Structure formats: C-alpha cells, structure tokens
Design a protein around this ligand. Structure first.
Ligand SMILES: [Mg+2]
Ligand SMILES: [Mg+2]
Ligand SMILES: [Mg+2]
Ligand SMILES: [Mg+2]
Ligand SMILES: [Mg+2]
Ligand SMILES: [Mg+2]
Ligand SMILES: [Mg+2]
Ligand SMILES: [Mg+2]
Ligand SMILES: [Mg+2]
Ligand SMILES: [Mg+2]
Ligand SMILES: [Mg+2]
Ligand SMILES: [Mg+2]
Ligand SMILES: [Mg+2]
Ligand SMILES: [Mg+2]
Ligand SMILES: [Mg+2]
Ligand SMILES: [Mg+2]
Ligand SMILES: [Mg+2]
Ligand SMILES: [Mg+2]
Ligand SMILES: [Mg+2]
Ligand SMILES: [Mg+2]
Ligand SMILES: [Mg+2]
Ligand SMILES: [Mg+2]
Ligand SMILES: [Mg+2]
Ligand SMILES: [Zn+2]
Lengths: 53, 122, 86, 203, 105, 50, 118
RNA sequence: CGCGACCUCAGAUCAGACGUGGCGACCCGCUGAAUUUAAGCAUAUUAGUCAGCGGAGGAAAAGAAACUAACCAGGAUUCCCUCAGUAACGGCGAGUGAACAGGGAAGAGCCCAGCGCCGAAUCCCCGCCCCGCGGCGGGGCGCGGGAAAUGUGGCGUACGGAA
C-alpha cells in the first residue's frame, strides 16, 4: 500500500531507532519491567490513587 | 385622507398590509394615468402615495424589529443586526468587567500602599 | 504603410470595463486590470504618481458609510436610544 | 526541579545523547511541510522561559527556513550602477532567520499574535524554529490580567514591526556607547532628528 | 570659487534639507498648552505640591561640575533605611525613590 | 455590433438617456447659471471610448 | 480485514449538519420584487394599440429582473386574467417590454378599458 | 481476531469566535538607486535618500542599565538648548560627523520563567433558576463536559527573596 506521509514517517522513525546507534541514556528506557511485576506494582498503586473531582 | 405615522402604530399587521396593498393599487392606477396623460391633480398624487407607502412600511418594519429585540432581550446569542453596531475596532475591545480586573498582587499592593493625601508647609 | 494604411486594421479591442474600478483597463487576454489590478486582492497604487492617487481616494466618491460614521462620532456612537417623545 | 536539569541538558549539544536526538528530530521535521502546527512545545522549559503557559489559547507552530545569505533579486548580472553596488552573491539579509520564521508564521496565522520563538534543530539547508502564538480572543487570555496586554490593537503583528525578541535584535537598539545610532525611537528616528534643521522664530 | 580672504566653510546643505525643516510657529501655542496642563495637574493634586515629590541632594560628576550640587532622581534605599522610611510607603507621601543609587560617601 | 452583452447594452442605454437637451424651465430658476447642456455627445464626433 | 487495493483512500467520516444557536439575521428579507413592483406601466403608443387590437395582447413595461413566468403570474393576479404566452425584449431605453397574450376567450381591449389605456 | 487507553494526524455547511481589504500626513520593520558634487572619474558624496514591500495607533517607537563615568561620582525612556560643525571618519580630497557632562519639558514604575512551598489550591465551555441586561457580566445549582502534573494559580524576581 502507498501509505500516507504521517504513517510512513512514524513507521520509518521506528526503523531509525533500530538502525542508528542509540546512546545508553536513551537505550535504558527500552529495558523495562516485565509482565508480572508491573501488575503487582499497579495493584499496589491502585490503593494510593489521588482523589477525583 | 392624510396618512399619519402616529395612528398606524396601534394597528395590527394584517390591517396594515391591507392598507399597503390598497395604496399599491393606488400607485398602479396613478401610473396608468401618468402614461395615458391625466390631470395634474392625479400627477401630483404620486409623491403623496409613495411617501404614505414608505410610512406604512417603516411602521411595519419598526414594529417587527421591536418585537425581535423584545424576543432576544435576555438571550446570550442574538442575530448580528440586533447586536450593537458600533465601529469594528470598538466592538473588538475589552469589556468594563475585563478592563476592571486586577491581579491578587496588585490588589494587595493597592491595599497595603494607598496613595496618601498630604501637604507640605511653606 | 506603417501609418494611415495600418490604422484601418484596429478592429478588435485589448481592454474592457473593469468590474472593480469601472475603468476600461481590464486586459481581456491577460485577465488583469492595468488600473486597479482586480484579481489581486490589494488595489494597485504607487507613490510615483500622486495625481493618480487623488483621482481614487476616500474623498473621491459617495462615502455612503464614512459620512454617517463621521456624524455618529460626535455623540459617542450612541445606539438603541431615542429622543424623549412629546 | 526537572526544568533546571533539562536546561543544563540542552546546553550539551555536542554530547552523544543530544547529537542523537537533534539528528533524528531534524530528520523528522525535514519530512514534514515548511510550516505546520506542533501539538505541544518541543522544548518546554525554554518555551516557558520565553512566555508560553500551558493553557488554552496558547498555540505552537513549527517552521523551517532556508539557510544562507541573501542573493540580490536582479537579472543575470546587471545590477546597474557604480562598482560599489555590483555585489550580488555575498550579501547578507539584515534580519535573522528566526525573525523570518516568526513573520512567516504570523502572516499565515493572522488571527493570532507572535510571542516568541526558539531553535530546535538545523542541518546544511534548513533551520527549524518553533513559534509561540497567542489567541487574543480566547477567554483564558482575555480574562487573565497578566496576559491581556497582547489582546490590544497596538500589538498587531509585533513580528512584522520588529517588536519580538528575534526581530528586536536586528534593530541595533540598547543602552550604551555601542548603540548611539538608535537614540530615540529607532535608527531612522535618530537620523530624522540629526538631519532635521531646527529653524526657530528668533534664530 | 574662493574670494580674496575668508574662511574655508563647510555648509551641511548637500542633502535634501528643505524637506526636514522644523519651524517653531507653534512655540507660543505649546507654551500655553504646557501651562494649562501644569495648572490642571496642580488642581488635580489639590494639597499636594505642584512640583511633585522631593528630590535629593546630589553631587555632580565629571570634574567641570564637581563643586556644584543638584537635584537628583530619588533618595537611595540606604538613605531611606537610615531615615526609617519604608521604600514602598515613601512613594505614597511624595518622596522620590530610585534603587539604582549608591552611597560612596 | 449586434452581438451585444447585457452590461454593454445597459451602459449604452444610460449614455443614450444622458444625451438629451436641458428642459426649458430650469433657467427661469433664481440660483441658475446653466445656459445649455455642455456634456452633450454626438455619435460621429465623440466615440465614447469602449 | 485485508487491504485489497494498494491505494490508501481517505475514509468517509460523519458530517453533521448546521444547527446554529442563533439565526445570523433576525428576519427573512421582504420580497422587494412584489407583483406591484414588477409591472410598472403599460404603453399607450399607436404601435401598442394595434398590438392590443389585432393580436389580442397587452404591452407592459416590467422590471428588468423579471422572468416570463413571473410576468405571467403577476398579470394573473393584478388583472385576474390568464396568459397564453409572454414575449419579452429589452429596449435601448433600458426598460423591459413585455407582450402578454391573453386567452382566446378573454378580450384584450375590454381588459384595457377597465385598466385605463384606450 | 476483537476491545480499551495514549500519541501523532485527518475530515466536517459541527458550536462559538478571529484575520483578510482601505486610508496612510505623522510611526515601525525591510529593501534600495541614479541624477548630483568631487570643476574628469572608479572609493566616497548624493543617501540609508527617492522609488518598491509589509504592519499599526491616536500617536507610534523607545523605556526602567550586561548604562554613563573615572568624579566629593551620577542613575529608565522620549523631546528642547548647549556640547558642536567638536572628538572622529574621509582618493585625510570633495565632504561627512556623534556621544558624555550641564540647564530644562515631563516624570511612574513594574511582572514572569527558574529556585521552592501549598491535597490543581487554577482556567474554559454547555443546560437550568433569578438579576443586570445597547462595551455579555453576577451569585446559586448540575454523581455536566473538557484544559492542565510534558505544570495552572497564590507567595515570590535581583531594589534580594522565602520559612
Ligand atoms: Mg504571581
Ligand atoms: Mg492580443
Ligand atoms: Mg497594498
Ligand atoms: Mg560610489
Ligand atoms: Mg569674483
Ligand atoms: Mg469616425
Ligand atoms: Mg459552524
Ligand atoms: Mg539594507
Ligand atoms: Mg563630476
Ligand atoms: Mg562640471
Ligand atoms: Mg559625468
Ligand atoms: Mg518611500
Ligand atoms: Mg492592513
Ligand atoms: Mg484608526
Ligand atoms: Mg507602546
Ligand atoms: Mg542620558
Ligand atoms: Mg563653539
Ligand atoms: Mg589627496
Ligand atoms: Mg553619511
Ligand atoms: Mg545628558
Ligand atoms: Mg523640572
Ligand atoms: Mg509555579
Ligand atoms: Mg533590573
Ligand atoms: Zn480595474
């Protein structure tokens, strides 16, 4: 498909982060908490939510 | 008879339109007389009938505009002809309310340090 | 040949009446006016012709809104009020 | 505060992190149009320092201009006159590219007012700036007495009359012995007073 | 061409000086306007002095004038602090204040 | 030509109506200076532009 | 869902209709091309009298913005007579002349008598 | 596959607003000559002037020091007198050419970002009730909707400030 410009631009922005040498201070955010610890963290964080309006 | 603007204002719109449509028949009858060639008394009545029609239509339009501005009196959005027509730059100004706000800093500054009235001996 | 004989072939016109300025300067083939420049949004005027500016200025025509503006200015642009009736 | 960290972070433009970010952002803005709306400020601390407040009616536009000097717009060679004014190639525009970017934003968006602008990237042929724009008819600006000065008709097209910071830097105004030629309103105002002959009644 | 004896004069009339000629025929008109504005201000501040706030004792720099004394722009913060007057209240009772001034002496 | 347009024919109509002499009764008026119509036009002499 | 064509087209979104909170003008304008304003006066000329007598027509000077349909339905209301056909021309005066042919059962000169032209 | 966020980007005759163009004497930002003078002429001079372009207001611009000074020191900006046809620039030729100090006209000062502390303590819009209502505002309700933590408001800004 001949995709629109914004779709093509974001898709080959996603490829440039795989091509170019990402410095470690930006690369450290790709290293992420795994699937089971995040649910425990949000389960704990649901008990300390700020009040609504 | 002399059609006056003072006694047309209490009348209803339909009996005003009846007089308007009668005076338009009068103009058509006078303009036939003008092109056939008629009396000067018939020729000079054209200006009389035309201004009477202008009077009746002025009363009708003024009454309709007054009822429209009575209907839209308390509404936030009103038609642009009923909105006030000043100059364009003067319609794009700030309000009394908007020019009369001052900040909490200037409010406490005016409170704490007011302009004193004083005099100096000679 | 170049003069009197050549003047007999003038039978099709270059300019017509412009629909914005009313002058016969609308070039039919360039589709633009040599007096006001009608397809341009701004009217054409220049400071190298002061005489051409004073033929089309705000005092030249009818002033059918500005002369009522000048009269309404003297009363602060009062609106929606009537004089007190008899 | 995080803003002090981001401010000192943007001062290390030769570092690996900033040379990565500036290059990928310059590539991204090179693929867009010459003028388009940014959804949010790219550099928030500097927009904040220049006067952007994150509320309704504050608009950010990102814009690119072409780099280099000003070639004289004259046919082939042929700038007719004395040898002083045969210069065409190495001439320079008297206003900065940031000042050009501000008026190119403000002319396309004539209903808004230019507040300031900042640099976000460049390459060999483009410089990228982001312009802060204020709607003067939104109520969040109209009813805020801190920022209701911009709503006044005096401040129409500040970026065209040279009243923003970027167009202000090119007028040569300031206090000191280095700016004697703009004493008064401006450079032309100094010239008018210095070349106006005062002929008194009693001489 | 020069005459027998005289000065070498350089008149600065080589530009279009006749366009920028400032005549002073409205000088007696602006004097009356300034006087009427002055009296209107003096009636607006009715018991307050017509000149305005009090100006401080100030020496002149730049050795041609260092013996004379002058009216300055405002009293300094050190002077107001020694006199016991708050800097945001001094301007309300007709004391001229500027914070740029220093006190070397 | 006989292949006129509406705006040209209307312009010719107005310039036809302005080409009449002055009425006889206007120079019996008090504040009158007009002797005749000086803005008159003949089809052979003045060619109306266009 | 598969992409059958290699062309991306803009998908058709919902378009709402105008529901303004106030009319832009307060009242509709009055129809200034009224049935009295559209017919000004007839001609009493000798070229129009033969046109009335022979061809059973009437000759009017009408407004220049008038259609043949409007002239027809204007004669049918002012003079209570139906129309066979309307033929219009624009004079070098600038006025629009209308030849209005009546029905075969109505007589144009007996209509002209009651309106005044004779 | 589907569903739900957020980001980025579209389309609306969507609801409510704004800009366009004119005049242009005075003002602001660019662009910008050649006649002329140098008894020629090319640097200069004409002149940052005419022409060209954009943008305003009843004035505009400037404006509260990254200042002047070298003193026993002054103290925002604008304008007048003087400095001064001076310092200085210049085929050092023709010509060009300020500023400080001083005397007056006027005189008015201020606010943010940051850094911090406060439960976003802040702002906009729609529906209803009453009032004002011809420069669309005020309080009261709405388990009404959004903006905003990628930072609104209060204190607070170089004269120090906060607890
Ligand atoms: Mg504050
Ligand atoms: Mg041709
Ligand atoms: Mg123009
Ligand atoms: Mg030269
Ligand atoms: Mg001699
Ligand atoms: Mg001929
Ligand atoms: Mg809409
Ligand atoms: Mg230049
Ligand atoms: Mg010479
Ligand atoms: Mg000579
Ligand atoms: Mg020569
Ligand atoms: Mg000019
Ligand atoms: Mg304009
Ligand atoms: Mg104006
Ligand atoms: Mg100003
Ligand atoms: Mg000074
Ligand atoms: Mg001297
Ligand atoms: Mg020499
Ligand atoms: Mg010079
Ligand atoms: Mg001085
Ligand atoms: Mg004084
Ligand atoms: Mg804060
Ligand atoms: Mg300061
Ligand atoms: Zn034209």
């Amino acid at each position: 498909v001949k995709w629109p410009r914004y779709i093509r631009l974001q898709r080959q922005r996603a490829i440039l982060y795989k091509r170019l040498k990402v410095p470690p201070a930006i690369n450290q955010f790709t290293q992420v908490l795994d699937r089971q610890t995040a649910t425990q963290l949000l389960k704990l964080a649901h008990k300390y939510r700020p009040e609504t309006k | 008879a002399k059609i006056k603007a003072r006694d047309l204002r209490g009348k209803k719109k339909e009996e005003l339109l009846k007089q308007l449509d009668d005076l338009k028949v009068e103009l058509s009858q006078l303009r036939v007389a003008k092109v056939t060639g008629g009396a000067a008394s018939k020729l000079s009545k054209i200006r009389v009938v035309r201004k009477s029609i202008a009077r009746v239509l002025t009363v009708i339009n003024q009454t309709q505009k007054e009822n429209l501005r009575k209907f839209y009196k308390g509404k936030k959005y009103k038609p642009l002809d009923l909105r006030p027509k000043k100059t364009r730059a003067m319609r794009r100004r700030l309000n009394k309310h908007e020019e009369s706000l001052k900040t909490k800093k200037q409010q406490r500054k005016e409170r704490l340090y007011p302009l004193r009235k004083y005099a100096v001996k000679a | 040949t170049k003069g009197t004989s050549s003047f007999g072939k003038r039978r099709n016109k270059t300019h017509t009446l412009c629909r914005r300025c009313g002058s016969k300067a609308y070039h039919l083939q360039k589709s633009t006016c040599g007096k006001c420049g009608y397809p341009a949004k701004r009217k054409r005027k220049y400071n190298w012709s002061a005489k051409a500016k004073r033929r089309n200025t705000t005092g030249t025509g009818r002033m059918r809104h500005l002369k009522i503006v000048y009269r309404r200015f003297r009363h602060g642009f009062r609106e929606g009020t009537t004089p007190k009736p008899k | 505060g995080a803003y002090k960290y981001i401010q000192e972070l943007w001062r290390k433009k030769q570092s690996d992190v900033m040379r990565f970010l500036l290059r990928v952002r310059c590539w991204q803005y090179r693929q867009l149009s010459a003028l388009h709306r940014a959804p949010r400020p790219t550099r928030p601390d500097k927009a904040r320092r220049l006067g952007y407040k994150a509320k309704q009616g504050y608009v950010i536009y990102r814009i690119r201009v072409r780099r280099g000097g000003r070639k004289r717009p004259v046919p082939k060679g042929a700038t007719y006159g004395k040898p002083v004014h045969h210069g065409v190639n190495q001439l320079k525009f008297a206003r900065s590219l940031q000042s050009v970017a501000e008026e190119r934003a403000g002319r396309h968006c004539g209903a808004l007012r230019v507040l300031n602008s900042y640099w976000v990237g460049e390459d060999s042929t483009y410089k990228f700036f982001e312009v802060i724009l204020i709607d003067p008819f939104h109520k969040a600006i109209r009813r805020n007495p801190d920022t209701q000065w911009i709503t006044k008709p005096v401040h129409k097209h500040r970026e065209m009359r040279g009243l923003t910071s970027a167009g202000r830097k090119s007028r040569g105004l300031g206090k000191g012995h280095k700016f004697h030629h703009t004493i008064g309103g401006s450079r032309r105002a100094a010239w008018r007073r210095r070349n106006t002959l005062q002929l008194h009644r009693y001489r | 061409a020069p005459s027998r004896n005289g000065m070498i004069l350089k008149p600065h009339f080589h530009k279009d000086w006749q366009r920028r000629v400032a005549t002073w025929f409205n000088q007696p008109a602006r004097k009356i306007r300034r006087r009427k504005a002055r009296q209107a201000r003096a009636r607006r501040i009715a018991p307050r002095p017509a000149a305005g706030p009090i100006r401080p004792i100030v020496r002149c720099p730049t050795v041609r004038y260092h013996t004379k004394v002058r009216a300055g722009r405002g009293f300094s913060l050190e002077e107001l602090r020694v006199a016991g007057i708050h800097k945001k209240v001094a301007r309300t009772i007709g004391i001229s204040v500027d914070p740029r001034r220093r006190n070397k002496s | 030509s006989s292949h006129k347009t509406f705006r040209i024919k209307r312009f010719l109509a107005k310039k036809q109506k302005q080409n009449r002499p002055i009425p006889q009764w206007i120079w019996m008026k008090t504040g009158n200076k007009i002797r005749y119509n000086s803005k008159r036009r003949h089809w052979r002499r003045t060619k109306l532009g266009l | 869902k598969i992409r059958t064509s290699p062309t991306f087209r803009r998908p058709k979104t919902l378009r709402l209709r105008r529901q303004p909170k106030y009319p832009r003008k307060s009242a509709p304008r009055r129809n200034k091309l009224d049935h009295y304003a559209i017919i000004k006066f007839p001609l009493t000329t000798e070229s129009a009298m033969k046109k009335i007598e022979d061809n059973n027509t009437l000759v009017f000077i009408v407004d220049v913005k008038a259609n043949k349909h409007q002239i027809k339905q204007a004669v049918k209301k002012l003079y209570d007579i139906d129309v066979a056909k309307v033929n219009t021309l624009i004079r070098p005066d600038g006025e629009k002349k209308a030849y209005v042919r009546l029905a075969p059962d109505y007589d144009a000169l007996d209509v002209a008598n009651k309106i005044g032209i004779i």
